């Protein structure tokens, strides 16, 4: 019932839920995603903080805006793995914020929304790029 969706959700959900308190490809992809994504957050903290400030997330209504950003980016016909990893990395950065404001329950839905839009808009590109195996290869060593 859509293995690509299931796999994508497992990887993306595990990474985002890790900010709150099964196959070989999925495990390696999670390790790659965390390694690259945590690096992006570390190196781009000021930029990410400024983007988060613009979102001004203080309540449930504000979390709607974030799903709209994801839709907005992935609706762009331009696709590459850098964009995919960066958007997920920003999702994890926001997930940390959600934890600190006692909105942990928004994190799993955020991961689901990211996954939904990613797969709905980029399925063909993802498969052409060898899916999550391709992701692991692109960011390898």
């Amino acid at each position: 019932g859509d293995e690509l969706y299931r796999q994508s959700l497992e990887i993306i959900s595990r990474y985002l839920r890790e900010q709150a308190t099964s196959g070989a490809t999925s495990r390696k992809a999670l390790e790659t995603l965390r390694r690259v994504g945590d690096g992006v957050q570390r190196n781009h903290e000021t930029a990410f903080q400024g983007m988060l400030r613009k979102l001004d997330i203080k309540n449930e209504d504000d979390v709607k805006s974030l799903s709209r950003v994801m839709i907005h980016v992935f609706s762009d016909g331009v696709t590459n793995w850098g964009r995919i990893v960066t958007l997920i990395s920003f999702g994890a950065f926001v997930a940390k914020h959600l934890k600190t404001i006692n909105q942990e329950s928004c994190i799993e839905p955020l991961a689901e929304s990211i996954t939904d839009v990613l797969v709905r808009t980029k399925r063909d590109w993802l498969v052409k790029q060898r899916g999550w195996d391709g992701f692991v290869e692109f960011f390898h060593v």
Binding site: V40, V73, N80, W81, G82, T86
Partner: peptide, 20 residues
């Protein structure tokens, strides 16, 4: 507009870094 565009641009810069 600036926010979406800045994220897209960062993603493209990260893409170029790892495509290298």
């Amino acid at each position: 507009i600036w926010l979406l565009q800045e994220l897209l641009r960062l993603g493209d810069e990260i893409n170029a870094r790892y495509a290298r």
